[PDB]
Each structure stands twice: as structure tokens, then as C-alpha cells.
């Protein structure tokens, strides 16, 4: 995020980091329950990648993080790699997340819910802060 | 890249207005947000765009794509969760 600010630690408890086996953060995701993470299809997750829950500072060794293995990747069959439309994947975890003060689920909308233009929302992540 | 988790608040746009920036690249399963002095950027992909509804944070978008320079005057593009939630529910029910 460019021109954002640091979050309060633990205040976005559904936010996860997807890391490859070298420890490199490549995408975010969100917990929707103890067993499932939603992310973008174009992130290209495999069962060799790791879901990291409960993290704030990726440079810290002292945080009580959960490193969760992925059982299966469910890429939405409507995903179109040419247009990047329908850009959603579900990850079924091999090991359930343990919910706590710093790890919990985001709500999903109903299909008919309305979010009007001009509404102020929030986005979070460990993406670049400057290009 | 930051070590520490970042946040930003930003407004939702309509798809019709987002098309002024991105043209025919914007599809019905996309939602735009930003152009407000902040931007999502590389490495944010897959993470949440949440809006508060009836006191609870609700997943409205999934960070998807946007400007190759993360311009803060151009809207970012997110997967529109309301268009995708029926598939989420079917997948969870079957697995």
C-alpha cells in the first residue's frame, strides 16, 4: 500500500500472508473460518506454499504466528487469466487455524448486498509502499 | 517492502466511472476503489478490501490489479466478492 499507515498490531485478525517455501511473502489472503482462506486466483498458490496467520511484523522472531499448510487449492472455474476476471481462489487448510485475539474470520456479504460508490472502506497488506 | 502490516482507507467507485480510467478492462466481477491519494500495490494482491456493514467488517473486494506504478490518482481493481460469494458457499458446502 502506497501512502498508508501502520496498523495496530492484531487489529485485522483475518489478514494472512502467503509465503513460498523460501519464506518470501508474495500475496495476502483472508480467513473466512478456521479451515479456509480466500485469496486471488492470479497469486498462483500451490500446496507447497504456507499460510501465515497472526503476523504483524514479518521481521520479528518473537510473534506467536501460525504457519498453516495447504491441503488443496480451489481456483474458481470462471477465472479468466487473460482478463484477470473472477480473480478468486479458496485454500483449504490441512491444519485448522486456532482462533484467538489476533486470528479470526472476516464476514462474507450476501450476493444481494449493496456497497455504494463513495463509501469509505479499508484495505490492508504487506505490499510495496513505493514503486 | 514493509515489515509491518499497512492499512489505508479509500472510497469505492462505480464501474461506470472506473471505466473512464480503465475502459473495457473493467468487468462485472470487478470493483474499483481508490484514486484518492492511496493505492494498493504489488504484494497486496489477494488481501482484503473490507467495508463495515451493521457493525461488522465484510469482505467486499480482493486486491487484484491496477496501475503498474501504483499511482495514487488511479483506481485499483479488486475482485467483487458479491459476484463470487455463491461459488464460495457452494465450494465450502461440497468440501
Amino acid at each position: 500500500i502506497v501512502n498508508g499507515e501502520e496498523a495496530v498490531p492484531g487489529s485485522w485478525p483475518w489478514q494472512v500472508s502467503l509465503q513460498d517455501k523460501t519464506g518470501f511473502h508474495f500475496c495476502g489472503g483472508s480467513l473466512i473460518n478456521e479451515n479456509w482462506v480466500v485469496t486471488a486466483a492470479h497469486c498462483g498458490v500451490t500446496t507447497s506454499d504456507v499460510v501465515v496467520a497472526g503476523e504483524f511484523d514479518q521481521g520479528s522472531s518473537s510473534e506467536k504466528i501460525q504457519k498453516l499448510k495447504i491441503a488443496k487449492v480451489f481456483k474458481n472455474s470462471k477465472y479468466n487469466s487473460l482478463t484477470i476476471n473472477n480473480d478468486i481462489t479458496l485454500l483449504k487448510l490441512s491444519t485448522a487455524a486456532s482462533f484467538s485475539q489476533t486470528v479470526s474470520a472476516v464476514c462474507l456479504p450476501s450476493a444481494s448486498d449493496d456497497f455504494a460508490a463513495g463509501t469509505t472502506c479499508v484495505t490492508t497488506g504487506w505490499g510495496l509502499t513505493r514503486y | 517492502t514493509p515489515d509491518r502490516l499497512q492499512q489505508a482507507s479509500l472510497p469505492l467507485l462505480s464501474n461506470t466511472n472506473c471505466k473512464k480510467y480503465w475502459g473495457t478492462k473493467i468487468k462485472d466481477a470487478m470493483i474499483c476503489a481508490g484514486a484518492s491519494g492511496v493505492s494498493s500495490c504489488m504484494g497486496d494482491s489477494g488481501g482484503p478490501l473490507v467495508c463495515k456493514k451493521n457493525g461488522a467488517w465484510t469482505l467486499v473486494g480482493i486486491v487484484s490489479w491496477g496501475s503498474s506504478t501504483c499511482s495514487t490518482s488511479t483506481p485499483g481493481v479488486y475482485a467483487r466478492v458479491t459476484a463470487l460469494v455463491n461459488w464460495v458457499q457452494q465450494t465450502l458446502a461440497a468440501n
Binding site: A7, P13, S100, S104, V122 | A56
Partner: peptide
Amino acid sequence: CGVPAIQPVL
């Protein structure tokens, strides 16, 4: 869902 134990500050 959707209600953090540690409240965000925007």
C-alpha cells in the same frame, strides 16, 4: 465474524 478483538484505529 467481522468483529476484531483488538479494535483497528484509522
